Design a binder for these strands. Structure first.
Ligand SMILES: [Ca+2]
Length: 86
DNA sequence: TGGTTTGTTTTGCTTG
DNA sequence: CAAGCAAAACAAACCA
């Protein structure tokens, strides 16, 4: 097993999180929520004391890879919609 | 206000 | 080298 959560990469997980939404787009917070609810390894690492490292990598992957694109959100103070780049 | 989130980038290290 | 994990500097936007 490549990582402690399996053979899927962070990018792969982010992809599954987004593909799981009916609208094919999720905010950063929703992607975190999907990890904690969907990946066994992260189930007990959603708290502030242990989520810093992996959340940082999620933000890192989202910005770094062209596979993901950011879309301006609707309304005041809401963060971007993240989706798969066609 | 002043701490927290979100987002962008760069760097270090390990593998195939 | 490319893929990827991990750590981290910085800064605009948020928001309690
Ligand atoms: Ca991107």
């Amino acid at each position: 097993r490549r990582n402690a959560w399996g053979n899927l990469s962070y990018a792969d997980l982010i992809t599954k999180a987004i593909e799981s939404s009916a609208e094919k787009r999720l905010t950063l917070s929703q992607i975190y929520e999907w990890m904690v609810k969907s990946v066994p390894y992260f189930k007990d690492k959603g708290d502030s004391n242990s989520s810093a490292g992996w959340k940082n990598s999620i933000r890192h992957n989202l910005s770094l890879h062209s596979k993901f694109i950011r879309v301006q959100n609707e309304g005041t103070g809401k963060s971007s919609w993240w989706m798969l780049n066609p």
